[PDB]
């Protein structure tokens, strides 16, 4: 989704998918979904 598109409110469906997704994921999470603009 473009950083210039719609912003749908987070709902019970979205939260459940993430919980399921975590279960479907593993230590591989390391590459979650957060990106740092500045150096760390």
């Amino acid at each position: 989704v473009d950083s210039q598109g719609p912003t749908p409110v987070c709902t019970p469906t979205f939260l459940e998918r993430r919980k399921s997704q975590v279960a479907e994921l593993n230590d591989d999470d390391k590459d979650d979904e957060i990106v740092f603009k500045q150096p760390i």
Partner: protein
């Protein structure tokens, strides 16, 4: 840097840390944002932090999904305190002061 931010993962385990060296920290999908998240439910600016010699103030730009702090929504501006945690949907960032 005195102010340090720790990233919380959906599993509840801390991973990479982000030092608030810059006087302003902007969270959201926008690239101009200091921290970008590839989630379609994240606002362009979601959350904005302004650091003044006085203290650190967190601003809520998320009109679609308000930012939660200490387990509570911050419809209005709030001063950051050592130990206060910012919570975004399933992700949160622990604020550490020096």
């Amino acid at each position: 840097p005195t102010r340090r931010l720790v990233t919380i993962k959906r599993s509840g385990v801390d991973g990479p840390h982000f030092p608030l060296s810059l006087s302003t920290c902007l969270f959201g999908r926008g690239i101009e944002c200091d921290i970008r998240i590839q989630l379609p439910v994240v606002s362009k600016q979601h959350c904005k932090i302004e650091i003044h010699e006085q203290e650190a103030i967190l601003h809520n730009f998320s009109s679609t999904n308000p930012t939660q702090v200490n387990g509570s929504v911050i419809d209005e501006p709030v001063r950051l305190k050592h130990g206060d945690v910012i919570t975004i949907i399933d992700r949160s960032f622990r604020y550490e002061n020096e």
